[PDB]
Amino acid sequence: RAYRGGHLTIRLALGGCTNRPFYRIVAAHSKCPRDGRFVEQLGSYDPLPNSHGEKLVALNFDRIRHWIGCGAHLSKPVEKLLGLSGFYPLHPMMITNAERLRRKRAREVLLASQKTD
Amino acid sequence: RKPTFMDEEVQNILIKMTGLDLQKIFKPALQELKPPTYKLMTQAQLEEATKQAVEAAKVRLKMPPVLEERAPINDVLAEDKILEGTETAKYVFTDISYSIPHRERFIVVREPSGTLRKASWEERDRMIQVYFPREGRRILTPVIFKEENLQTMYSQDQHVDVLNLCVAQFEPDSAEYIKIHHHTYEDIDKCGKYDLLRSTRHFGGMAWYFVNKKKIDGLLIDQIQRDLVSDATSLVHLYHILHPXXXXXXXXXXXXXXXXXXXXXXXXXXXXXXXXXXXXXXXXXXXXXXXX
Amino acid sequence: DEPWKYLDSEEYQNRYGSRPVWADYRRNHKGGIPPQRTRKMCIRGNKVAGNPCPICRDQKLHVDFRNVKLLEQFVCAHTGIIFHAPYTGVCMKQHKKLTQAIQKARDHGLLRYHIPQVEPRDLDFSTTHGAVSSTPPAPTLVSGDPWYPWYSWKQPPERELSRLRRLYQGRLREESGPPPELMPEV
Amino acid sequence: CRLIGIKDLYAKVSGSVNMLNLTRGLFLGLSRQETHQQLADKKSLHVVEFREECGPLPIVVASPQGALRKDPEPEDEVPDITLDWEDVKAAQGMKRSVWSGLKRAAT
Amino acid sequence: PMKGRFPIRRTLQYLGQGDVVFKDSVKVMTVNYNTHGELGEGARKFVFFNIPQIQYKNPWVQITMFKNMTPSPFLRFYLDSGEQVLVDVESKSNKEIVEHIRKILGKNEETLEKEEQEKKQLSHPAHFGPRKYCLRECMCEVEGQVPCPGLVPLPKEMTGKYKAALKAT
Amino acid sequence: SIARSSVHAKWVVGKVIGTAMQKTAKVRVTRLVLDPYLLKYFNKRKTYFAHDALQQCTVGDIVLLKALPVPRTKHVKHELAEIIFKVGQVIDPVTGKPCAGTTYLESPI
RNA sequence: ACAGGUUUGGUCCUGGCCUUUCUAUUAAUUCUUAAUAAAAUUACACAUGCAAGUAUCCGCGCCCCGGUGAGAAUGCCCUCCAGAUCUUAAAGAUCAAAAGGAGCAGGUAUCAAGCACACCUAUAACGGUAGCUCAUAACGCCUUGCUCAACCACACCCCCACGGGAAACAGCAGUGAUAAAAAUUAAGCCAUGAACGAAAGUUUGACUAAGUUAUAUUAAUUAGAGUUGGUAAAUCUCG
Ligand SMILES: [Mg+2]
Ligand SMILES: [Mg+2]
Ligand SMILES: [Mg+2]
Ligand SMILES: [Mg+2]
Ligand SMILES: [Mg+2]
Ligand SMILES: [Mg+2]
Ligand SMILES: [Mg+2]
Ligand SMILES: [Mg+2]
Ligand SMILES: [Mg+2]
Ligand SMILES: [Mg+2]
Ligand SMILES: [Mg+2]
Ligand SMILES: [Mg+2]
Ligand SMILES: [Mg+2]
Ligand SMILES: [Mg+2]
Ligand SMILES: [Mg+2]
Ligand SMILES: [Mg+2]
Ligand SMILES: [Mg+2]
Ligand SMILES: [Mg+2]
Ligand SMILES: [Mg+2]
Ligand SMILES: [Mg+2]
Ligand SMILES: [Mg+2]
Ligand SMILES: [Mg+2]
Ligand SMILES: [Mg+2]
Ligand SMILES: [Mg+2]
Ligand SMILES: [Zn+2]
Ligand SMILES: [Zn+2]
């Protein structure tokens, strides 16, 4: 419908049968609903790892960049995605979650050997 | 030299070798039927219709491309060990863009090992099959290609079907394509069933795999028993094109060559069982002197 | 479980003749048009209900992917598509078991179905392309470098850090952040 | 049709359904039949079945015993035929009756 | 249909089958035809068969018809520019008129084929949506993926309430 | 190059129905419409007022209307361009001679 | 529709009514457990608790989601875009108000005439003509969301909210009254989406995961209901 404002935004709509999530990468308006209207579909993402042990992600790189070149905003998980692919530089928060997780794993190694003693 | 399937010599010779059978070419199919259409025609109109048929049949008859094998492609586009500790199962990134040739698509992976690897060939294909679903293809490999199911389908003399199955399911440069096509040729050879694939578009693969396996036996025997001389002729012709320098080739060529001389000199110079050729090449010959 | 046997038996050949199974069977129903799908199951526990299906009224019949002689008569000869239950008269359970059966049958090729002539996937196949052919791996790779300087953790000037503490003074939570490099644990 | 041995047929009946008129009608109609041989003979041309499953293959059914004409026959862009509104309504997807597409027992 | 004297032309099949598409310039088309004369004969047929084909394929082009104004039959065409085309149809065959029109303001076969392909590229195989616009839908469906719980109930492990009751204890 | 009219009417032809206003012509347009039940084409009519400098339109005229770039009134979006057939005097586009019905008034030669 | 029953002493013919198929509420009789979808009488009145915040000020957000179908023959479709916002080395992009019109668009003609519904002057707000709509349905009246990857409309009522009644859950839960119509005064921002943030991040009754219900499919652990003159599967003895 007609809105006051907002920007073109690339994000993850959630189609899912409940406990089995799945996502549709979508070029939309910020001010429309999650699963509602959009401009164009871009890709999909499947979180749940398949028979081969893989998480499938399809992206139309040509169109994705056609819209960023029109100034669409990316949601943070679409940036995690674009990060991994190498279409985009890895996202800073990824690296930080890395460091955090590594530090907690080291602290838990020390907790393990302090409980063993 | 440069012989290959797509050369004009090899092509025109393999089209002539194959043959047009409008009954086996156009055969009842299992699809839901419709009521038949009728029209009254002249002799002329029926002739033109017949040629129309033959023209359209050729397109049905077009040979499936034969190709050499592909090598495994292993290349890493980047490595960050920092990501490795995420310990998440594999991520598969496909490009879907409608303009692109599917060998020009970009298919990538990030493993738990924190590296950016390109997709393997099988992987790459099942990906494109997901996002560009094409009929007949299973995205997970169909059971029937196990040896048991293979033998079962051979027994039933269905070999055209198997070879029609691989064309759709796998890719012409794949490993499995080649394994199944070639193994299937071995079967028609040991069973002497060669006339099966005769009016089929699969004939080209019969001819080639055998000229390059250098066993022309069953096909020559059969051709002479089927009372086809010209085919055995163009076939020896072929073994000479794919083997230009050999005793048999240059000798039985430059000495002299025609039906009798080239088929019998290549029956003496190909020794797999030359006794078979020489037997049948007598029989046909005899069956001429009685008919003429 | 051995399928082929009962179809070649003299008992069977006596009973059914060369007519298919279900030929004589007739499903009784409320009017001129039968309900659009037959009964859910004709067998619950030890009880056989009413006038049973072709398949289940005769217990010696086994639905498998193996016997092609049984599964054949439930597929349309010319059209190569299965019948919906009402055509035949089998119960829903045996009909679902029959569909699933014919499937594994065609997956083992014990049966015929129609296989169409498909062209090759690609038109022009060139293995040459840079996606297929291994690239010139990055100048950044050759060195063993992180792809960018910021993947690497850099311990900051003490000035910036103490001014940072000076900013947040009451709320600061300060615990050392060097990022241990190797992951695995118990 | 089981008594005649006709195994495949579509037949819809309109108007009064009374049994006798129906069987008389049906029998008149199935004796009203023009056979391929007879078509061939009166038109002196070949008659050719085009199957859909068999593609373009121009199967001959009937040949005109006697002289096959050297004359092609007029192809009108516009044939003039009685067309039944029911068939044409069927053709365009306009039969929506819930009774029609029903599953029924075997023949 | 029963009523009408050439009922085949009240079909949908007869409508789709007529081939003339008009260029983007054509706006108005004016058929002036004549009732009485032998030399009118072709023109009439064109109105009676082909006019309803033409129009169908070009629903935005006004097609008007005048009777017995002018003693000789013709077509007029009014293009976007203010270009006035005048097509004399006299002893012409019906078929001849059709093909002549197709020549003058037509569309090259390649043009049409191009356009239909440019519209067919709009529906992309790989997307996921309602059965109307797309093929596949949830990715319940595609083989290697997870079966969606409607068909195939899930592992006790992967249920929310399993995780919840495990994290509570 | 911008001179436009948002109206699909851009060029039409219609009869001239009435003269009742100053320098404005009442012109009836008729397009074919496909009745979906019958699948037949019938004449749907629609009236358009048009503007006239010369006030030259008699009733019954076959007239060519051109869309006007900027609308004059709610009800006037057009300008009479050319008179296609002036009524009762009709000069054959082909031969350029005066005619009535089937008959030329002045023939060739 | 593959049709079937039913007019008469009987036969055709015409011609309604009904059966037979599928879905949805609600009721009665029964009812074991999971899983998944769906959840709804009421633009009647509402106790209480919550449904917007963020953030070095300022700013920005704050019917956006979410709810409803009250209204309006509304509208579908198609032109053309003011404005708002986003990106940016000034032009792209997303929404798209107003304004339009090829065509399509509920019933009713026992609603047949409406009563100024037109144009012309560019003079620069005055004059001049006498028109316009309409049986191809004007102008009425009656009923109504929809053509559905969504769109239209409302937000206590007076179409509109200055002002007036009067103090608003048609947000989430709940509750009176009403109706054949009965889900938790439930836990979390862990995923997504949104708002702010330079950022970690914070909030989110959106949503996520649950909870309740044979409402529908699926699986089994569960056996009951209806029928038995005919159409139409199926009966003996009593009263
Ligand atoms: Mg009576
Ligand atoms: Mg009586
Ligand atoms: Mg009487
Ligand atoms: Mg009645
Ligand atoms: Mg209830
Ligand atoms: Mg809404
Ligand atoms: Mg709604
Ligand atoms: Mg209402
Ligand atoms: Mg109203
Ligand atoms: Mg109305
Ligand atoms: Mg607009
Ligand atoms: Mg009255
Ligand atoms: Mg005045
Ligand atoms: Mg209000
Ligand atoms: Mg106020
Ligand atoms: Mg209220
Ligand atoms: Mg509430
Ligand atoms: Mg409120
Ligand atoms: Mg209550
Ligand atoms: Mg309810
Ligand atoms: Mg809460
Ligand atoms: Mg739930
Ligand atoms: Mg149930
Ligand atoms: Mg019980
Ligand atoms: Zn059964
Ligand atoms: Zn699903």
UniProtKB/Swiss-Prot annotation, chain C:
Assembly: Component of the mitochondrial ribosome small subunit (28S) which comprises a 12S rRNA and about 30 distinct proteins.
Biological process according to GO: mitochondrial translation
Portion of the full-length sequence here: 53 to 238 of 258
Family note: Belongs to the bacterial ribosomal protein bS18 family. Mitochondrion-specific ribosomal protein mS40 subfamily.
Protein name: Small ribosomal subunit protein mS40
Species this chain originates from: Sus scrofa (Pig)
Gene Ontology MF terms: structural constituent of ribosome
One annotated Gene Ontology cellular component of this protein: nucleoplasm
Cellular location(s): Mitochondrion
Keywords from the named record: Mitochondrion, Phosphoprotein, Ribonucleoprotein, Ribosomal protein, Transit peptide
